[PDB]
Design an enzyme around this catalytic site. Structure first.
Site, PDB file in Angstrom:
ATOM      1  N   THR B  23       0.821  -1.215   0.000  1.00 46.44           N
ATOM      2  CA  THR B  23       0.000   0.000   0.000  1.00 46.44           C
ATOM      3  C   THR B  23       0.854   1.264   0.000  1.00 46.44           C
ATOM      4  O   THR B  23       0.581   2.182  -0.760  1.00 46.44           O
ATOM      5  CB  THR B  23      -0.980  -0.064   1.177  1.00 46.44           C
ATOM      6  OG1 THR B  23      -2.065  -0.888   0.828  1.00 46.44           O
ATOM      7  CG2 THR B  23      -1.566   1.258   1.627  1.00 46.44           C
ATOM      8  N   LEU B  59      -6.494  -0.490  -5.374  1.00 47.01           N
ATOM      9  CA  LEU B  59      -5.144  -0.646  -4.848  1.00 47.01           C
ATOM     10  C   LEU B  59      -5.179  -1.199  -3.418  1.00 47.01           C
ATOM     11  O   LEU B  59      -4.449  -2.136  -3.110  1.00 47.01           O
ATOM     12  CB  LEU B  59      -4.452   0.719  -4.987  1.00 47.01           C
ATOM     13  CG  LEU B  59      -2.945   0.756  -4.713  1.00 47.01           C
ATOM     14  CD1 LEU B  59      -2.357   1.960  -5.436  1.00 47.01           C
ATOM     15  CD2 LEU B  59      -2.548   0.849  -3.251  1.00 47.01           C
ATOM     16  N   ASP B  60      -6.079  -0.693  -2.568  1.00 47.60           N
ATOM     17  CA  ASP B  60      -6.230  -1.127  -1.173  1.00 47.60           C
ATOM     18  C   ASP B  60      -7.215  -2.279  -0.946  1.00 47.60           C
ATOM     19  O   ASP B  60      -7.296  -2.762   0.177  1.00 47.60           O
ATOM     20  CB  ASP B  60      -6.668   0.070  -0.305  1.00 47.60           C
ATOM     21  CG  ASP B  60      -5.527   0.836   0.373  1.00 47.60           C
ATOM     22  OD1 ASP B  60      -4.352   0.414   0.288  1.00 47.60           O
ATOM     23  OD2 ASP B  60      -5.842   1.846   1.044  1.00 47.60           O
ATOM     24  N   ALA B  61      -7.898  -2.812  -1.958  1.00 49.74           N
ATOM     25  CA  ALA B  61      -8.936  -3.825  -1.756  1.00 49.74           C
ATOM     26  C   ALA B  61      -8.476  -5.056  -0.956  1.00 49.74           C
ATOM     27  O   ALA B  61      -9.027  -5.340   0.106  1.00 49.74           O
ATOM     28  CB  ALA B  61      -9.532  -4.203  -3.114  1.00 49.74           C
ATOM     29  N   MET B  64      -7.245  -4.271   2.703  1.00 55.19           N
ATOM     30  CA  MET B  64      -8.342  -4.122   3.663  1.00 55.19           C
ATOM     31  C   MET B  64      -8.905  -5.475   4.115  1.00 55.19           C
ATOM     32  O   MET B  64      -9.268  -5.628   5.276  1.00 55.19           O
ATOM     33  CB  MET B  64      -9.437  -3.181   3.154  1.00 55.19           C
ATOM     34  CG  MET B  64      -8.934  -1.753   2.890  1.00 55.19           C
ATOM     35  SD  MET B  64      -7.774  -1.020   4.085  1.00 55.19           S
ATOM     36  CE  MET B  64      -8.815  -0.975   5.566  1.00 55.19           C
TER      37      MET B  64
END
Lengths: 50, 83
Positions: B23, B59-61, B64
């Site tokens: 990230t 990008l963060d899927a 998370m």
């Protein structure tokens, strides 16, 4: 395509004449026409380079 | 008992550490290009911000998901019950 830069020539006299005789008023008609615009620049109060 | 609990702390560190590493680099790459585009066309900045946020979601899927499985392994551990 390049709005990133504006050249100084894109934001806000050279006189051509002959070297010899036999000209039928060619140079005189040009100087007569130039003097009108130089006088106009002095009514505006601007300096002139030639 | 002690091995499962000890190796579940290492699992949590990897799920959040590997996610944080990716990230941080991913936003360094994406954000760097957002500044390059904004400098070239400062009138398109409103449109570039929304387009950057669309990509930020992608990008963060998985990061998370990993950070939610790591706070689940920490509180009410699923592997302790299995043994």
């Amino acid at each position: 395509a390049n709005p990133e830069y504006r050249h100084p020539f894109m934001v806000e006299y050279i006189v051509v004449s002959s070297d010899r005789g036999l000209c039928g008023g060619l140079n005189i008609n040009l100087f007569k026409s130039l003097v009108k615009d130089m006088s106009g620049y002095r009514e505006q109060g601007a300096e002139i380079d030639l | 008992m002690e091995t499962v609990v000890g190796l579940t702390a290492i699992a949590v560190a990897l799920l959040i550490g590997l996610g944080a590493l990716g990230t941080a680099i991913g936003f360094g790459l994406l954000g760097g290009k957002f500044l390059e585009g904004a400098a070239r066309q400062p009138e398109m900045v409103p449109m570039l911000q929304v387009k950057m946020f669309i990509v930020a979601g992608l990008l963060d899927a998985v990061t998370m998901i990993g950070v939610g499985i790591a706070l689940f392994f920490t509180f009410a551990n699923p592997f302790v019950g299995q043994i």
